[PDB]
Amino acid sequence: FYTLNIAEIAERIGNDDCAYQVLMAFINENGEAQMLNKTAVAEMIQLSKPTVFATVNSFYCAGYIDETRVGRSKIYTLSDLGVEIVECFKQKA
Amino acid sequence: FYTLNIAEIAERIGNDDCAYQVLMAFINENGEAQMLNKTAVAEMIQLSKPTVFATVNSFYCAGYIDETRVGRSKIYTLSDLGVEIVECFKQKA
């Protein structure tokens, strides 16, 4: 339905500390994408649960992270869109 | 760069109270899209500033709302993408 420029998105995220760290949390010590529950993310970055959780929620809405039911809770991984956004940043650095 | 299905997004937002209300806040009494600062939104919906603000920020990242500098602060309006998402909901109702 709608075409998306991945460079603008990455540009926007880069200008917003919380979005940026929420995104990068899913990338591990060896550069590999990983699974995380909401609590892990909030613990990993130094921002409050409300901030981090709301960001996680919106990023799943945006389709940047995936949600999958696991136990009676949920886990988050970067979507293919998520991984592509992360790539723009890696190239900068 | 990336194609987007507007129905899935709307589906995701509809399953998340905060995202949904943050989005609809921009639609006024007469059905018209309107401008809002971050404070207006948080005051309008009954959720905490941290939740609402983080959601606003991520929605601008996603390209659902636009940011424009005004005074030395910012204001938010739905993008064309934002308006299209709102339309799916209007059709449901």
Curated annotation (Swiss-Prot), chains A, B:
GO molecular function: DNA binding; identical protein binding
Impact after mutating residue 38 to A: No DNA binding
Phenotypic consequence of residue 74 to A: Decreased DNA binding
GO biological process terms held by the UniProt record: plasmid partitioning
Disruption outcome: Loss of plasmid replication. TubZ levels increase, TubZ still polymerizes.
Biotechnology: A miniplasmid containing this and downstream gene tubZ is able to replicate in B.thuringiensis subsp. israelensis and express insect toxin proteins. The miniplasmid could be used to make plasmids for insect toxin overexpression.
UniProtKB keywords: DNA-binding, Plasmid, Plasmid partition, Repressor, Transcription, Transcription regulation
Ribosomal protein listed as a keyword: no
Reported impact of residue 58 to W: Dimerizes, decreased DNA binding
DNA-binding region per Swiss-Prot/TrEMBL record: 38-45, 49-60
Induction of the gene: Probably part of the tubR-tubZ operon.
Variant or mutagenesis effect after changing residue 62 to W: Dimerizes, decreased DNA binding
Summary of the function given for this chain in its UniProt record: A DNA-binding protein that is part of the type III plasmid partition system used to ensure correct segregation of the pBtoxis plasmid. Cooperatively binds to the centromere-like site (tubC), which may seed filament formation by the TubZ polymerizing GTPase, stabilizing TubZ filaments. TubR-tubC complexes track the depolymerizing minus end of the filament, probably pulling plasmid within the cell. Required for plasmid replication. Negatively regulates levels of TubZ; its effect on RNA expression has not been shown.
Domain notes for this protein: Although this has the same function as TubR of B.cereus strain ATCC 10987 there is little sequence homology and the dimerization interface is different.
Miscellaneous comment in the UniProt entry for this protein: The pBtoxis plasmid encodes all the major endotoxin proteins (Cyt1Aa, Cry4Aa, Cry4Ba, and Cry11Aa) responsible for the mosquito larvicidal activity of strain 4Q2.
Record note on quaternary structure: Homodimer. Binds to tubC DNA, the TubR-DNA complex binds to TubZ.
Official protein name in the record: DNA-binding transcriptional repressor TubR
Species name: Bacillus thuringiensis subsp. israelensis
